[PDB]
């Protein structure tokens, strides 16, 4: 998503459903490639030690001064009628500059944003409807005009404008936890394996304390640890080396 071709609008975003994988969130904060890296509620270093059920990456492009409006508890036209954030938003909002990638010569006016709607949208709800509602008491009933405002408007993405109007690729990371088992977790940082020493061990399946040494036991390929007659961890299999 960071190296994608081109993002969509702020109301018709391509929600990439992330599942059945692992992702290091602490390496993205120190990657020195993002212009804005600020999470809300949950630290990105704590995301590697926590699992989530479904992860949604809402990718859209806004202007330079609109990065403060993509936050829980803020106002704005894009925050109410385009991308509604909940009051308990525990995700993360990242951004980086894309003025030399998404802009065009003379101005990229393909990105749209909704100005108004009949009602406020739900949090994490995508609406691609283009219904036109009148402003005054006289409806236009189709073709706009005579006090009939168009709900959309073209974004102005020029290569020579100020920093507040440059295109900025913003990917909002949505996190949730339900009764379903989790699919997205963080990668456990591995260390060197030391044998023939009274030290601790912490594998992917079970941890404990004891000296690990080679023997003649052979485990099944779908097992990671074992128990004796007294129900005590007496033998373990290394996850990296078989």
């Amino acid at each position, epitope marked *: 998503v960071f190296n994608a071709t081109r993002f969509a609008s702020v109301y018709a975003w391509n929600r990439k459903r992330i599942s059945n994988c692992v992702a290091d969130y602490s390496v993205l904060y120190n990657s020195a490639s993002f212009s804005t890296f600020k999470c809300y509620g949950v630290s990105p270093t704590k995301l590697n030690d926590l699992c989530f059920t479904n992860v949604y990456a809402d990718s859209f492009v806004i202007r330079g001064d609109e990065v403060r409006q993509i936050a829980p508890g803020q106002t704005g036209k894009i925050a109410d009628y385009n991308y509604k954030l909940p009051d308990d938003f525990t995700g993360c909002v990242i951004a980086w500059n894309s003025n030399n990638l998404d802009s065009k010569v003379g101005g990229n006016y393909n990105y749209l944003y909704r100005l108004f709607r009949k009602s406020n949208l739900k949090p994490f709800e995508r609406d691609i409807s283009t219904e036109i509602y009148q*402003a005054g008491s006289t409806p236009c009933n*189709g073709v706009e*005009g*005579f006090n009939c*405002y*168009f709900p959309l408007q073209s*974004y102005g993405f020029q290569p020579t404008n100020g920093v507040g109007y440059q295109p900025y690729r913003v990917v909002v990371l949505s996190f949730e936890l339900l009764h379903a088992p989790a699919t997205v977790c963080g990668p456990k940082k591995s260390t060197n394996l030391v044998k023939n020493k009274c030290v601790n061990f912490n594998f992917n399946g079970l941890t404990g304390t004891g000296v690990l040494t080679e023997s003649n036991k052979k485990f099944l390929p779908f097992q990671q640890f074992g128990r004796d007659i007294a129900d005590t961890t007496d033998a373990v299999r290394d996850p990296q080396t078989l």
Partner: antibody
Amino acid sequence: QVQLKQSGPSLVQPSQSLSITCTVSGFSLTSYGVHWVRQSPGKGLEWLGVMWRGGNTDYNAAFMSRLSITKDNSKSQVFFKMNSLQTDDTAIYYCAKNGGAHAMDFWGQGTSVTVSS
Amino acid sequence: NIVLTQSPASLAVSLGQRATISCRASESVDSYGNSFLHWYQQKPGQPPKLLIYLASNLESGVPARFSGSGSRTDFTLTIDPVEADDAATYYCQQNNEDPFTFGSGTKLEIKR
């Protein structure tokens, strides 16, 4: 990316008819409405009318009975048909790109229209 | 007919200060959540351009020095700070009621 130039009128006689052609290029004409104004006809900025998005037409109070707007979606050009031209219609006409809440965001170059006996 | 009384006719604001241009409207109000108008800036040797729509958002092509607010009837344009490229006339356009005409024109002059 926004081309709203005008050409065609050079010198018009009074009590005649001539249509001003504003060539629309660079963007979709069927998604916006071309406006029409004048540049300093004695007073400051004056507004004439607004072409809808392929529908009806709206005009000013002093410019409805004599002026008419014709939108051609095939040739990507918006015509401004003028009827009963007098000496008071000597101004520089402009075409504008429609915004979201009926705004005039982008502008064109236009041409100089001079009507005199 | 909507008579957009624009006051004053001229101003003398130096560099680094804030200019105040008023605009009075009557009809109409209460579009969807606001009742504001549009602002424009017309140079004597250049076609005009849109500065800020509905007095609460931003518009590309112009710097972010143009802002403002107002009530349902009176409107205020805020030019802060005034640079060396603001010596032009200003207008306000009605958007809630036909005719969608402009104002009289406030000729802003840079006090040098």
